[PDB]
Design a protein around this ligand. Structure first.
Ligand SMILES: COc1ccc(Nc2ncc3c(n2)n([C@H]2CC[C@H](O)CC2)c(=O)n3C)c(C)c1
Length: 804
């Protein structure tokens, strides 16, 4: 009766937040009640009308390539009733002015054209102009906001050295315990136990005294415990808790098993108590509670040394000379905004006096607050290397400036950045909540980004579940209903995917698939649901006739659905692929960097025609993918030079379209050539590369003799070259222009890649350093990328054959 709402959330989240079996403290519960106020703050402040209609707008300028589509400075928009009427409108006109009570909704979508923004600033308009599609809208009644209703003694006095006694270990299946006092990634001090023979139970009952004092312990200090037989098991314990108190008492911590990573810094313990290793520890308990409280100019040559350090990439290491120089001239380093990540690495966190000096420094935020928002720099202070709550907070405040559109660009990476946070109720977690509760699109993707990690990562499911419950308790009854219609479908369809995969090592499989879905369609399944990757799109009834099982090494479910919106322009079905086997969380990350790459090029007035298809990971190596209409594989066309160009002319009806297809190929090919090379996912097979009948080429399957990228003689013949051509010159020109544009955002791409490698996947990250050629000049870099084209031209088909 009363607890029916919590059980409703538990089914949506995929984890029971009310469960307190895998906890040793009230951390998750304190953060649950602490997340009430920021949720209430956004629910009360948000506009009912604007939130219900969720307008997707951008304050960014209109691109140079998109102005070419608007003739005589007036675009055409058609308003529907049975009857339609075309209206010529200026790009600077507001929807109300075109309206001359009634809303302008997109035909066949849940996207609305409202607010004090011009038509050129609407994301749907910029999309229609790109693909060369007519802007079709319908005079609708505004959606009711009532559908979105919401249901309702000092530590610095302790001069004694820190110690912790390791009682023993226990496993049902030579060894020693490695104790570490960690702050981020840096180890303050290390102490190891005597090596005793490895058995079922190994007791020590000995105190491990550290060099660090109680006074010198910082906020967010971790007690890293490691088992070496070499490394086998790991576990962590936050020494200074969420209530600013030094931990006390007996603890039995279940350790995570191995075989660097975001999964190592986790405060959460192993839920598998009947199969994992455990550790018994005791912390010095006291009667009184121990709580934690709250110039001259640089010379010419030394300034040249300091400015050189700030100028280097985020991966370049800081020596003792570098760290001491940055800390001594911290006030001059404070003047430079790019110096902040390198400066906050130069500070001794295991020293009470030094940490206090970092706080009085940070107080003079006069230059940081006034500085231009650098997302690369902002994200830099949110990684594994930064664990001070106050240092991480100065980055989160800069993210507040970021508009809704740009929040969507980095939403996935910001969600993964929570893994690097020492405590649960953090500024970043509170930020993701507020931005998710303000905008329906941000909140929708937030739900799926959180639900993806909960379903797989047991290391962070407890943390992400309390963030999802906090979002879910303010998204409104309308979204809560939609999220259930989505969950019910994705869960029922995940069952069929794993069932069909188990039945295959044909006529039998396709007849059994059509059997399994038919009885599901005429049962408890919803009549309509929202597409997790395209929330504007709404899929209805299953097209059982068009449903099939794909023929590959894995057995995915090719599913087709009729559109729920009857105001849709075409009767075209929605295609969704349910695939098990590959890690879709990796595909999710690469596709996001690809979307960022498109925005990076947009600011530089470039359009490299990338196709970043929809992909949402739902469970254990299982999720959904977008079916790209009128698109096939390169290997499918082969099942050698003329073969690809002939397919383009065959699928082209008029010469007007084939001359457009060759241009659509030149941009899309060069775009994926640059993108895949930078991220180190360029040496791929024809089966993992696709092309549309419109000429748009795109890379697929990012589930983890050599060549930098794919530029085979079948593609070069489309351009008209054999081992120059007017199209090939256009290709190399845009290849240089696109590569040069990404080098202007090196630190962004370095920090995006570094995070991806830690949350999704040391020497491996070092790849982008050479790929984006750090240290070299713009003219020197031009020759490097042109030489990579020459490697592809010399190799040709040699690499493609080698893939067995
Ligand atoms: C994460 O990888 C994926 C999976 C499916 C799609 N969508 C998709 N739409 C239409 C397709 C298609 N795939 N394929 C594949 C099947 C998988 C195989 O590996 C390659 C060929 C086709 O033959 N047609 C006609 C994408 C864009 C990426």
């Amino acid at each position: 009766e009363s607890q029916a709402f919590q059980r409703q959330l538990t089914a949506l989240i995929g984890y029971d937040v009310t469960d307190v079996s895998n906890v040793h403290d009230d951390e998750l519960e304190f953060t649950r009640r602490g997340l009430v106020t920021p949720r209430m703050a956004e629910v009360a402040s948000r506009d009912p009308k604007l939130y219900a209609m969720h307008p997707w707008v951008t304050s960014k300028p209109l691109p140079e390539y998109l102005w070419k589509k608007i003739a005589n400075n007036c675009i055409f928009i058609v308003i529907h009733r049975t009857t339609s009427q075309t209206i010529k409108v200026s790009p600077d006109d507001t929807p109300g002015a075109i309206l001359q009570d009634f809303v302008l909704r997109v035909c066949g979508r849940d996207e609305y054209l409202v607010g004090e923004t011009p038509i050129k600033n609407f994301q749907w308009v910029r999309h229609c102009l790109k693909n060369g599609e007519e802007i079709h809208v319908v005079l609708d009644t505004p959606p009711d906001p009532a559908l979105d209703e919401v249901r309702k003694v000092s530590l610095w006095d302790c001069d004694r050295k820190f110690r912790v006694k390791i009682r023993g270990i226990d496993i049902p299946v030579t060894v020693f315990v490695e104790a570490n006092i960690q702050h981020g990634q840096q180890v303050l001090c290390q102490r190891r136990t005597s090596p005793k023979p490895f058995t079922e139970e190994v007791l020590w009952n000995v105190w491990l005294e550290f060099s660090i004092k109680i006074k010198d312990l910082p906020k967010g200090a971790l007690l890293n415990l490691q088992i070496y037989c070499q490394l086998l098991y790991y576990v962590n314990l936050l020494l200074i808790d969420h209530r600013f108190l030094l931990r006390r008492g007996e603890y039995v911590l279940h350790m995570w098993q191995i075989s660097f990573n975001a999964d190592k810094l986790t405060s959460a313990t192993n839920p598998d108590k009947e199969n994992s290793m455990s550790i018994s520890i005791l912390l010095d308990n006291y009667c009184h509670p121990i709580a934690l409280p709250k110039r001259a100019e640089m010379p010419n040559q030394l300034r040249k040394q300091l400015e050189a350090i700030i100028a280097t990439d985020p991966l370049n290491p800081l020596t003792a000379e570098d760290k001491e120089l940055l800390w001594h001239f911290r006030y001059e380093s404070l003047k430079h905004p790019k110096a902040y990540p390198k400066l906050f690495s130069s500070v001794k966190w295991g020293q009470q006096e030094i940490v206090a000096k970092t706080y009085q420094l940070l107080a003079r935020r006069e230059v940081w607050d006034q500085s231009a928002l650098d997302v690369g720099l902002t994200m830099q202070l949110l990684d594994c290397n930064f664990s001070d709550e106050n240092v991480r907070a100065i980055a989160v405040q800069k993210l507040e400036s970021l508009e809704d559109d740009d929040v969507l660009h980095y939403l996935l990476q910001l969600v993964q950045a929570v893994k690097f946070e020492p405590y649960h109720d953090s500024a970043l977690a509170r930020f993701l909540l507020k931005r998710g509760l303000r905008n329906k699109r941000i909140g929708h993707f937030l739900f799926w980004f959180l639900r993806s990690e909960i379903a797989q990562s047991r290391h962070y499911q407890q943390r992400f579940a309390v963030i999802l419950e906090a979002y879910l308790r303010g998204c409104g009854t309308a979204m809560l209903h939609d999220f259930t219609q989505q969950v019910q479908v994705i869960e029922m369809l995940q069952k069929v995917t794993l069932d069909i995969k188990s039945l295959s090592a044909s006529s039998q499989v396709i007849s059994q698939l059509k059997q399994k879905l038919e009885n599901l369609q005429n049962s408890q399944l919803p009549e309509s649901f929202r597409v997790p990757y395209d929330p504007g799109l709404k899929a209805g009834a299953l097209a059982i006739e068009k449903c099939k099982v794909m023929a590959s090494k894995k057995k995915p479910l090719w599913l087709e659905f009729k559109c729920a919106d009857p105001t849709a322009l075409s009767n075209e079905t929605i295609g969704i692929i349910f695939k098990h086997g590959d890690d879709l969380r990796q595909d999710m990350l690469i596709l996001q960097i690809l979307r960022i790459m498109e925005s990076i090029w947009e600011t530089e007035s470039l359009d490299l025609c990338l196709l970043p298809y929809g992909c949402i990971s739902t469970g254990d190596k299982i999720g959904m993918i977008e079916i790209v209409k009128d698109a096939t594989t390169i290997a499918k066309i082969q099942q050698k030079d003329e073969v690809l160009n002939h397919w383009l002319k065959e699928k082209s009806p008029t010469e007007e379209k084939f001359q457009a297809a060759v241009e659509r190929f030149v941009y899309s090919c060069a775009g994926y050539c640059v993108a895949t090379f930078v991220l180190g996912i360029g040496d791929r097979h024809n089966d993992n590369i696709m092309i549309t009948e419109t000429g748009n080429l795109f890379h697929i399957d990012f589930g983890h003799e050599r060549v930098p990228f794919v530029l085979t003689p079948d593609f070069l013949f489309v351009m008209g070259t054999s081992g120059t051509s007017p199209h090939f010159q256009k290709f190399q020109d845009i290849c240089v222009k696109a590569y040069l544009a990404l080098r202007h955002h090196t630190n962004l791409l370095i920090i995006l890649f570094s995070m991806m490698l830690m949350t999704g996947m040391k020497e491996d990250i070092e790849y982008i350093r050479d790929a984006l050629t750090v240290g070299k000049n713009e003219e020197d870099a031009k020759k490097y990328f042109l030489d990579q084209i020459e490697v592809c031209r010399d190799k040709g088909w040699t690499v493609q054959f080698n893939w067995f």
